[PDB]
């Protein structure tokens, strides 16, 4: 794992080009960023529209075929053969969607939220923003939602928008050998991390209909200095993506004048009279946050021990395709078993089923366990919300909730592309609704005991107990419900669920980051670590170069095979810092004492190794002056600076190599991400 | 006096007293065909003549409708139109609300046949025998009409009430049921699929 | 021997539906007859109260009321209540809907005197003079009752009478007040708007 | 003007303090920040509720006295006495309100928003966060609004919440001379700027019902590094503020469980399906942003020249009182002349006029120019958004929009506590409704040309053109209209308004900052600035101190009376650290001359440090030394002298610094950057 070099060099070639660009009148590299942020938002909204349309048509076809087969063998009596169809139809879509993740690109597995959360921190997962990853993740999340797994499709929209963002901003393909002569200025890691931040915000905004929650998501992960123009561009892209999704889906729904679907999930309207809360049920919400904190801890611990089994045993690509197919057949079978043995029936209440399956009901009514399945989980989240009381049976809703918990915990580390927000919101709104049935039983039909109000708090509690998002998730929940007064009980519930969750276990997104062993700087230094200085956490025998260094020892430092370093201060008073990629581009063009920033950005993705460049014996005795190619003002800390002081220069102004100096300006020690996340 | 301020013009009092005559008739028709829901087939000419009597005043329009904060002739006609739209009585009528459509008059004749067979076949086992064949074609014709009117996009309240009575009389209060023993093959395929994960997890753990 | 309430009603509840259908057709025709000269809250306030009694005598409630997705007696009683509380006919009645209250019959008496005094003095110069005090005591009583309600719209029966009287007094009579008051308003307005330029010049020059 | 000193020293006393409070049984200090922020939110919400109830009951009594005499003299004659009564009542309330700002505390004049932006930027305006400043701004807003001025009250909640947040965060009242010592740790100005940010955000959320707009307001100002738990505490205080206002106003209005008043202004709800927008009127929305930018530039130019007239000539407090009285008298007469001469009458629908005047109307109708006045401007804004078409005569709104534009521009620089958000929204919703009346006429009453929707876009356009804030204003408008899809046209309109307005003149808050010579720092380096290096920005001769030197050098450096510097790098001439003036005064008052001096001894005189004139050292004390090792900042931030100006400016701004030491190729101090050399460009 390598870091991205987000801090610019500001060398002589940087200063010479920024003078050349501000001599051509009406300097235009700033308007290009606005064009790119608009295109990022438009394309993220279009990919969300493509996923939504394809998933609803293919799921419509599959459930229509399965419904037509249950209806045929109902009174004839061959319902064993109709379990075999739905087990096979789930297994066939999950087979195709798990081969393309396990055999072609395994970084597409799961949601890409830990990987983009690691990219905005500053490590590069190796294939995270390639075009092949985008294609596989979009086709795989479609094939895994159609394959019937206990998953969602909103989580993978963050990674898709970030890949689009890193793709169109470069003006190159890099997989197709296309060099468009259009931008060429944005091919550094500063611009890329800024645009991927914009694309991740656009992905959140398309997923939930929450643009400001997407902006706050991008500001939490990627916790930098305040940049007014970047936050304004990110907000611009986020609004563009919400509007583009809504506008193309309203054309497809046949109206175009009702901009009514801003996200991929739409919580509805909470301005009702039954939806109002009072101050006396604030500790009821605190108790629900306690319950959501302890169930998310059980969810995370059972998934930790399930992930630990799989890394040691189910880790061959053919062996993890077979696991996903079996989970698909078992979800089909457990759904059919709960549907078959269910007894409550129910008539239509205005499109509340959309595949009304009469199995054994009384010819005007329909099987209501079959309506908990056979729906999208989004429609089930919206229907546990907003329904009038008496709409659910406590036995069947309680038995659906218990089963879906283990099905969604057992479907998270599978080798498919898949989200976990919508399973968490469905688990929480289900036991949130059941808490409302008991409240409406123990107090009579009181107006404040509306069970659709408690599904919201329960969904917030379970989503906060599994993944411990507080500030962005409160704004997402408050912005999807269109009610600003709900953010006070929602934020109390999310505080309580984070505290009660963090006492037990780490949290689902951080836990897989920790199991994949990436460095991953946190928000602050650890609490019992204020007594350390910089001289404890630093790398003390620093390998250095000089301003006028001989060439035969530059190639000797870069060829060591035990000390794979990428940052070299050039000195022994500190004069600056040079990178490994720059000083390989210096040796390729033979820049000796025996280049105008186009060349240091020409070979920019995947710089060549030192075992690809041939220096003759006569050229190992000449000199390479590094004085105009080095970063002349690197960031330094004194040797006595405390660890919270050096943690916050590193994380905020996102650094790669931090030099520790004496009071003689003598280089003693070097600080990077590994030296500074191991405490 | 000036006209229209304390009283009514004489060519405007007559057009209120005939709309008063047909609206009482329509209200009485609704409440008399209320619970055996014969609504859309009994009250359609009274409804059409209420609509015509309002069209014959909206063509003293300024002296009846737009002359008060409370518009009694407006809100009572709008109530009749909301009643007519919510019943979907246009499904029961053919093309121009002249007579009952062929679909509904054919459906309401089988409903009579099915109820006469229910009465003649009066232990509900002689009811369930010899009359499952009429309930089947009745339910299939109901599904046919329901998908037929879905090819335009509830049905008419006159046919939904009849099918509601028939299903409520057949499923409960007759308890005509089909046994359909299919538990044993369903359990055996359920247990076989749920036993595949423990085989996969053990055989990958041992090997 | 088809069971009761499935194909049709028993006659103990049928006749109760019939005499709900009687008093509800009388009330609708009364609402249309006494509509534009709005005598609504006083012509048939007893016809509204017999409907509420017939709506209470049906509580065979699960037979008639809640047996269908289209509950005709329920929606018609909701319509009559929504008409009755939007017309505010409780203000025209005294305490328990026995007869008209003293205040409203006194106002209608003054309204009758005001229109007869309009009719006697019928170029409406004889109207504005010699009939102004009746209009003023009528408007004073209307304002008194309008403030008496706000402590606790008025009844539509008295609001339409005041609307007729005001629309008759303002236009087609053109009674008005001369109000020669423009010149002192001009004087006081020009005096105050001239103070800022005096203040600004006096603070500019003395510096 | 001085700076905050937001960066902690982290001297050996600080390390001793943290290490000592970390050995106790339980560390309570992070939990105390949460109870301080909850109290900040509760008290900000209660101050907003107090202002709302008192303004409602005082202005309710005032318009009944005026209506009772306009209705009395309208048939007998004598309407000039009701004009004299209304001008005299306005003059009396604004007399009392302006005499307590002009004579007692002049810094409470206007809204507190430029002063709070300067405090979050790191400038100390000498009275901002102080108890006498709070009680005159709270009471002066009431007397400014009840006195009939063309102002708003929602604007100065930000300064009120900021003063509450800076006052209760200490357990000490420096005005009432009491000390209930509970919050001693937080007397250190790193905490104080972090608490004022939460109080400003709570003021924004109690003003508009927009909590996320408060957090984004106080993140834009105070543009620091990302602090996750500070931002989460600010969001906590902001939510508690809007909830406290909504709950106590629901108790006051009756129907306790009807929470329908989140802010002091409530825009209503915009899901009526006549409010929906399309994609082809996106360039119609861009055209309104051009109009808002041009009209806001006109507004700011007129207010600039009026303010430049008032600096030179109307600066005595008595003349400022007379000027405030004459504006309040003229506002009454302008309103009365437009009410008297108007021939527009309409009947009342429901609660629509709230004090109707049947002046010359036909006994069931009421004057509609009298309803543009005599209402609260919040009610005029809300009615301009949600009334159906045909509800406004174009000539009436035209004359009201024309005179209220010039009344609001003439009232802003007065010596009263008063906001300008609500007059800007009312100006813009007024011509925005006229522009919807014009589009509904050309298209023949099209459904998409609903004029209430265009009132909303024009209000945002005018508020963007006058004060040129984006990204905080955009989220406030999204969160008050309760509509996510509206944030796309509102963002487009605010972009267009800011871009069109910036080519003529600066924003109103920026103009009132720079008219009073405040050394204010913008978000980045001005134009190109990579051609300008750190060597050419900073002060080239630097007065340093040694680690262990005689105090006669200390006294002579501190009592120079020609420089007045507050930061001194301590050297050998290699840099060793940084010492302040205040710390050095505490080191001189106690006779710490060459371990009984803990870090609580620097927080004793923390707001008011004594001058060097209060320290008396003898001839013998001047010859002994003072080892500045335990007390200096052992690691100040430092740039080399070849560093670019954006690399210098970004480091200084994001850390809240007030001293940045410029250094050699060795560790030898060659310069110093101290906030005015970054603001000179
Ligand atoms: N020039 C150097 N001299 C000595 N140690 C170094 C040098 N550069 C890095 N290290 C140390 O090498 C160890 C491994 O980090 P590594 O060398 O991979 O970092 P890097 O190449 O600077 O960047 P990255 O973290 O992105 O890989 C760390 O302890 C780091 O401090
Ligand atoms: N110790 C110092 N030696 C020399 N020049 C200094 C020193 N401190 C500040 N200056 C410079 O003196 C000028 C006046 O600033 P001033 O002395 O008021 O700064 P300060 O009090 O240290 O900081 P501030 O006023 O911004 O809080 C500035 O150009 C500043 O850079
Ligand atoms: C007084 O009478 C006038 C008409 O003479 C009423 O005005 C009508 O009001 C309704 C809605 O309030 C409109 O739909 C009509 O178009 C209006 N009529 C005309 C001719 O414009 C008015 O409502 C009456 N006032 C009261 C209190 O009943
Ligand atoms: C079929 O008949 C049943 C009763 O026999 C109807 O049930 C009532 O429906 C109304 C309106 O939906 C509810 O308010 C009542 O609570 C229901 N009563 C009972 C006892 O369930 C049902 O609506 C009818 N269905 C149709 C399609 O007409
Ligand atoms: Cl998801
Ligand atoms: Cl996810
Ligand atoms: Cl304001
Ligand atoms: Cl303001």
DSSP per-residue codes, C82-109: HHHHHTTTTTTB-SSSSSB-HHHHHHHH
H-run or E-run covering D312: helix D282-312
Per DSSP, which regions of D253-410 are E strands? Answer: 345-347, 365-367
Q: Are the CB atoms for C93 and C101 separated by under 8 Å?
A: yes
Q: Are the CB atoms for A657 and A577 separated by under 8 Å?
A: yes
Burial D441-473 (b: 16+ CB within 10 A, else e): eeeeeeebbbbbbbbbbbbbbbbbbbbbbbbbb
- Domain assignment present for residue A594? The answer is yes
Centroid of ligand 2 to alpha carbon of D566 (angstroms): 6
> Distance from D328 to chain C by nearest Cα, in Å?
11
Q: Does C171 touch chain D (CB under 8 A)?
A: yes
Domain boundary among B35, B59, B87: B87
D550 and D625 in a single domain? The answer is: yes
- Domain assignment present for residue D223? The answer is yes
Method by which this entry was solved: cryo-EM
Q: Does A531 touch chain D (CB under 8 A)?
A: yes
D243 and D293 in a single domain? The answer is: no
Q: Does C150 touch chain D (CB under 8 A)?
A: no
D55 and D189 in a single domain? The answer is: yes
Q: What whole-number distance in Å separates Cα of residue D143 and Cα of residue B45? A: 69
C34 and C70 in a single domain? The answer is: yes
Q: Are the CB atoms for D653 and D519 separated by under 8 Å?
A: no
D594 and D647 in a single domain? The answer is: yes
Q: Does residue A657's CB lie within 6 angstroms of at least one atom of ligand 1?
A: yes
Please give the number of the atom of ligand 1 that sits closest to the Cα of A541: 4
C73 and C17 in a single domain? The answer is: yes
| Residues of A in Cβ contact (< 8 Å) with D231 | 471
Q: Does C197 touch chain D (CB under 8 A)?
A: no
Query: Do D485 and A235 count as a contact with CB atoms less than 8 A apart?
Result: no
The closest of D403, D321, D391, C69 to B160, measured between CA atoms, is C69
CB-count burial class (<10 Å; 0-12, 13-18, 19+) for D388:
exposed
Q: What whole-number distance in Å separates Cα of residue D222 and Cα of residue D219? A: 6
Q: What whole-number distance in Å separates Cα of residue A10 and Cα of residue D550? A: 43
B126 and B158 in a single domain? The answer is: yes
The closest of C3, C57, C55 to B31, measured between CA atoms, is C55
**What is the CB < 6 Å shell around ligand 2?**
D 2-3, 539, 542-543, 564-568, 658, 672, 674-677
Pairing of strands A667-671, A658-661: antiparallel
Q: Does A552 touch chain B (CB under 8 A)?
A: no
The closest of D201, D192, D244 to D221, measured between CA atoms, is D201
Q: Are the CB atoms for A451 and A439 separated by under 8 Å?
A: yes
Q: What whole-number distance in Å separates Cα of residue C157 and Cα of residue C160? A: 6
- Domain assignment present for residue B63? The answer is yes
Domain count, chain A: 3
Domain count, chain B: 2
Size (chain B), residues: 207
Burial A260-295 (b: 16+ CB within 10 A, else e): ebbbbbbbeebeeeebbbeeebeebbbbbbbbbbbb
Q: Does residue A190's CB lie within 6 angstroms of at least one atom of ligand 1?
A: no
H-run or E-run covering D671: strand D669-673
Q: Are the CB atoms for D377 and D426 separated by under 8 Å?
A: yes
Query: Do D488 and A210 count as a contact with CB atoms less than 8 A apart?
Result: no
Domain housing A640 = 527-677
- Domain assignment present for residue D319? The answer is no
Q: D648: Cβ–Cβ under 8 A, 6 or more apart, which residues? A: D534, D537, D639, D660, D673, D678
Domain boundary among A452, A486, A515: A515
- Domain assignment present for residue A257? The answer is no
Q: Does A84 touch chain B (CB under 8 A)?
A: yes
Of B167, B197, B204, the CB nearest to A364: B167
Q: What whole-number distance in Å separates Cα of residue B4 and Cα of residue D514? A: 69
Query: Do B186 and A87 count as a contact with CB atoms less than 8 A apart?
Result: no
A318 and A435 in a single domain? The answer is: yes
Question: Does the annotation place A673 within a ligand binding site?
Answer: yes
* C:21-60 residues touching chain B, CB 8 A cutoff: 21-22, 24-26, 28-29, 31-33, 35-38, 40
C164 and C132 in a single domain? The answer is: yes
CATH of the domain at D630: 3.10.580.10
Packing angle of the helix pair A79-99, A131-146 (nearest 10 deg): 170
C79 and C118 in a single domain? The answer is: no
CATH of the domain at A496: 1.10.3080.10
The closest of A411, A409, A457, A408 to A434, measured between CA atoms, is A457
Show the DSSP H helices in A147-182 as ranges: 156-168
Question: Does residue A668 sit in helix, strand or coil?
Answer: strand
The closest of A417, A282, A372, A329 to A90, measured between CA atoms, is A329
Please give the number of the atom of ligand 2 that sits closest to the Cα of D569: 1
Backbone angles phi, psi at D205, to 5 degrees: -70, -35
**What is the CB < 6 Å shell around ligand 4?**
B 160-161, 164, 168; C 66-69
Q: Does A229 touch chain D (CB under 8 A)?
A: yes
Domain housing C54 = 11-86
- Domain assignment present for residue D260? The answer is no
CB-count burial class (<10 Å; 0-12, 13-18, 19+) for B194:
middle
Q: What whole-number distance in Å separates Cα of residue A406 and Cα of residue A404? A: 6
Gaps in chain C following residue numbers (C to N > 2.5 A): 59, 122, 152
Question: Does residue A562 sit in helix, strand or coil?
Answer: coil
C74 and C107 in a single domain? The answer is: no
D620 and D573 in a single domain? The answer is: yes
Centroid of ligand 3 to alpha carbon of C163 (angstroms): 9
DSSP codes joined into one string, D500-568? HHHTT---HHHHHHHTTT-----SS-SS--SSSBGGGTSBSS---EESEEEHHHHHHHHT-SSS---EE
Question: Does the annotation place D185 within a ligand binding site?
Answer: no
Query: Do C199 and D326 count as a contact with CB atoms less than 8 A apart?
Result: yes
Tokens encoding D466: 């006058």
B78 and B31 in a single domain? The answer is: yes
Q: Are the CB atoms for D648 and D537 separated by under 8 Å?
A: yes
B67 and B118 in a single domain? The answer is: no
Q: Are the CB atoms for A649 and A655 separated by under 8 Å?
A: yes
D50 and D87 in a single domain? The answer is: yes
Q: What whole-number distance in Å separates Cα of residue D154 and Cα of residue D203? A: 9
- Domain assignment present for residue A185? The answer is yes
Q: What whole-number distance in Å separates Cα of residue A23 and Cα of residue A623? A: 34
Q: What whole-number distance in Å separates Cα of residue D124 and Cα of residue D2? A: 6
Packing angle of the helix pair D131-146, D158-168 (nearest 10 deg): 160
D110 and D233 in a single domain? The answer is: yes
Pairing of strands A576-579, A567-570: antiparallel
D375 and D286 in a single domain? The answer is: yes
CB-count burial class (<10 Å; 0-12, 13-18, 19+) for C28:
buried
- Domain assignment present for residue C60? The answer is yes
- Domain assignment present for residue D141? The answer is yes
Q: Are the CB atoms for A135 and A147 separated by under 8 Å?
A: no
Q: What whole-number distance in Å separates Cα of residue D184 and Cα of residue D194? A: 16
D174 and D294 in a single domain? The answer is: no
CB-count burial class (<10 Å; 0-12, 13-18, 19+) for B101:
middle
Q: D516: Cβ–Cβ under 8 A, 6 or more apart, which residues? A: none
Pairing of strands D660-663, D638-640: parallel
Packing angle of the helix pair B19-32, B44-55 (nearest 10 deg): 160
Centroid of ligand 3 to alpha carbon of C49 (angstroms): 28
Question: Does residue D382 sit in helix, strand or coil?
Answer: helix
C116 and C151 in a single domain? The answer is: yes
B21 and B82 in a single domain? The answer is: yes
- Domain assignment present for residue B109? The answer is yes
D77 and D212 in a single domain? The answer is: yes
A245 and A291 in a single domain? The answer is: no
Question: Does residue C41 sit in helix, strand or coil?
Answer: helix
Neighbours of B66 (CB within 10 A): 9
CB-count burial class (<10 Å; 0-12, 13-18, 19+) for D176:
exposed
- Domain assignment present for residue B135? The answer is yes
Backbone angles phi, psi at C136, to 5 degrees: -75, -40
Half-sphere exposure of A90 (CA within 13 A, CB side): 24
CB-count burial class (<10 Å; 0-12, 13-18, 19+) for B38:
middle
Domain boundary among A515, A545, A569: A515
Tokens encoding A372: 């908990």
Q: Are the CB atoms for B178 and B129 separated by under 8 Å?
A: no
B107 and B73 in a single domain? The answer is: no
Q: What whole-number distance in Å separates Cα of residue D396 and Cα of residue D338? A: 9
Q: What whole-number distance in Å separates Cα of residue A241 and Cα of residue A239? A: 5
Centroid of ligand 3 to alpha carbon of C100 (angstroms): 26
Tokens encoding C32: 């249309």
Question: Does residue D576 sit in helix, strand or coil?
Answer: strand
Q: Are the CB atoms for C156 and B69 separated by under 8 Å?
A: yes
Tokens encoding C56: 């209470």
Q: Are the CB atoms for D622 and D555 separated by under 8 Å?
A: yes
- Domain assignment present for residue A585? The answer is yes
B65 and B110 in a single domain? The answer is: no
């Amino acid at each position: 794992y390598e870091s991205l070099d987000y801090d610019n060099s500001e060398n002589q070639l940087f200063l010479e080009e920024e003078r050349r660009i501000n001599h051509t009148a009406f300097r235009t590299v700033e308007i290009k960023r606005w064009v790119i942020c608009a295109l990022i938002g438009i394309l993220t909204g279009l990919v969300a529209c493509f996923i939504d349309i394809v998933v609803e048509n293919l799921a419509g076809l599959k459930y229509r075929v399965i419904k037509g087969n249950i209806d045929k063998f109902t009174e004839k009596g061959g319902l064993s053969f109709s379990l075999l169809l739905w087990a096979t139809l789930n297994a066939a879509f999950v087979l195709v969607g798990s081969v393309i993740v396990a055999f072609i690109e395994p970084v597409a597995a799961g949601s890409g939220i830990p990987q983009i959360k690691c990219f905005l921190n500053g490590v590069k997962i190796p294939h995270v923003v390639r075009l092949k990853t985008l294609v596989i993740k979009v086709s795989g999340v479609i094939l895994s939602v159609v394959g019937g797994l206990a998953v969602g499709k909103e989580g993978p929209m963050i990674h898709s928008g970030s890949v689009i963002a890193a793709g169109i901003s470069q003006g190159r393909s890099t997989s197709l050998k296309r060099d468009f002569k259009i931008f060429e200025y944005f091919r550094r890691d500063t611009e890329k991390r800024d645009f991927v931040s914009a694309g991740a915000a656009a992905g959140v905004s398309a997923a939930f209909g929450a643009p400001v929650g997407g902006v706050l998501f991008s500001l939490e992960e990627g916790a930098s200095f305040w940049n007014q123009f970047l936050t304004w561009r990110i907000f611009f892209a986020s609004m563009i993506s919400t509007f583009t999704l809504n506008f193309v889906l309203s054309i497809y729904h046949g109206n175009m004048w009702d901009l009514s679907s801003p996200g991929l999930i739409n919580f509805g309207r909470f301005d009702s009279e039954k939806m109002a809360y009072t101050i006396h049920e604030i500790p009821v919400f605190i108790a629900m946050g306690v319950v959501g904190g302890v169930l998310g801890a059980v969810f995370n611990a059972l998934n930790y021990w399930l992930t630990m089994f799989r890394i040691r045993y189910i880790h061959r690509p053919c062996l993890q395709v077979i696991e996903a197919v079996l989970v698909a057949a078992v979800t089909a079978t457990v759904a059919f078993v709960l549907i078959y043995s269910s007894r409550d029936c129910q008539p239509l209440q205005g499109g509340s089923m959309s595949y009304p399956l009469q199995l054994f009901c009384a010819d005007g009514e329909y099987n209501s366990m079959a309506a908990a399945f056979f729906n999208t989980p989004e429609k089930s989240v919206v229907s546990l919300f907003h329904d009038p009381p008496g709409s659910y049976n406590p036995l069947t809703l309680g038995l659906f909730t218990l089963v879906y918990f283990f099905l969604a915990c057992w479907t998270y580390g599978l080798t498919v592309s898949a989200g976990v927000f919508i399973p968490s919101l469905l688990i929480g709104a289900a036991w949130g609704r059941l808490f409302g049935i008991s409240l409406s039983y123990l107090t009579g039909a009181a107006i404040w005991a509306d069970p659709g109000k408690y599904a919201l708090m329960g969904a917030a509690a379970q989503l906060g107990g599994i993944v411990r998002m507080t500030l962005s998730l409160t704004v997402i929940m408050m912005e999807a419900t269109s009610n600003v007064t709900y953010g006070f009980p929602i934020m109390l519930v999310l505080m309580t669920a984070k505290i009660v969750g963090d006492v037990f276990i780490e949290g689902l997104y951080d836990m897989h980051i920790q199991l994949q062993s990436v460095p991953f700087l946190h928000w602050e230094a650890p609490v019992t670590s204020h007594s350390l200085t910089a001289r404890e956490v630093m790398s003390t025998p620093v390998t250095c170069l000089r301003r006028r260094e001989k060439v035969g020892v530059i190639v000797d430092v870069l060829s060591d095979t035990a000390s794979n370093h990428n940052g070299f201060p050039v000195v022994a008073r500190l004069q600056g810092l040079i990178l490994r990629s720059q000083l390989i581009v210096l040796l390729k063009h033979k820049v000796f004492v025996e280049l105008r920033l186009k060349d240091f950005r020409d070979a920019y993705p995947r710089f060549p190794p030192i075992q690809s460049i041939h220096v003759s014996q006569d050229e190992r005795e000449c000199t390479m002056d590094l004085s105009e190619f080095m970063n002349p003002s690197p960031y330094t800390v004194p040797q006595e600076a405390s660890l919270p002081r050096v943690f916050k220069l590193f994380r905020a102004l996102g650094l790669r190599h931090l030099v520790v100096v004496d009071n003689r300006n003598q280089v003693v020690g070097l600080v990077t991400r590994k030296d500074l996340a191991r405490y | 006096l000036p006209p229209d301020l304390p009283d009514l013009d004489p060519e405007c009092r007559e057009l209120l007293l005939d709309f008063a005559n047909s609206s009482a008739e329509l209200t009485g028709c609704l409440v008399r065909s209320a619970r055996p829901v014969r609504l859309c087939q009994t009250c359609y000419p009274l409804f059409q003549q209420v609509v015509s009597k309002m069209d014959n005043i909206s063509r003293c329009a300024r002296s009846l409708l737009m002359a008060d904060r409370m518009q009694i002739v407006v809100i009572l006609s709008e109530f009749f139109n909301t009643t007519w739209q919510e019943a979907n009585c246009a499904n029961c009528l053919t093309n121009n609300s002249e007579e009952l459509s062929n679909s509904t008059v054919y459906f309401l004749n089988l409903f009579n046949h099915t109820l006469t067979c229910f009465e003649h076949n009066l232990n509900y086992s002689e009811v369930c025998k010899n009359c499952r064949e009429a309930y089947k074609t009745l339910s299939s014709l109901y599904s046919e009409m329901q998908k037929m009117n879905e090819l335009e996009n509830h049905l008419c309240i006159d046919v939904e009430d009849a099918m509601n009575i028939t299903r409520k009389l057949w499923s409960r209060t007759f308890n005509c049921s089909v046994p359909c023993s299919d538990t044993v093959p369903v359990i055996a395929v359920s247990v076989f699929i749920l036993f595949l994960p423990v085989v996969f997890y053990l055989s990958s753990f041992l090997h």
